[PDB]
Amino acid sequence: VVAKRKAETGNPNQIGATMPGSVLEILVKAGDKVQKGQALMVTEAMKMETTIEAPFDGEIVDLHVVKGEAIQTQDLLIEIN
């Protein structure tokens, strides 16, 4: 079981998972330009749905999760620049 890359604490370029759960749907792919509030992916915690929004305007660097993947708190979901 290869441990997952965590989001760096206090790094606002890296969005980490806030609660354990799984990834339902990814809406973007590496390189895309994006605006504050724009929906980037959807996740679930106890089958309740959350949409991950961009914290500010910028370019997507990469994804670090795949569809249906399981995730724990702090896991790195996406990096933004």
The residues of the shown chain that bind another protein, judged by CB under 8 A, are 18-19, 45-46, 48, 73
The rounded distance, in Å, linking the Cα atoms of 47 and 36 is 26
**What is the nearest approach in angstroms of another protein to the Cβ of residue 21?**
11
Select 1 or 48, whichever has its Cβ closest to another protein: 48
**What is the nearest approach in angstroms of another protein to the Cβ of residue 18?**
7
Select 56 or 67, whichever has its Cβ closest to another protein: 56
- Tokens describing residue 28: 């973007």
**What is the nearest approach in angstroms of another protein to the Cβ of residue 30?**
27
Select 3 or 48, whichever has its Cβ closest to another protein: 48
Angle at 56 between CA 17 and CA 6, to 5 degrees: 25
Q: Which residue has the tokens 């809406």?
A: 27
Pairing of strands 70-71, 76-80: unpaired
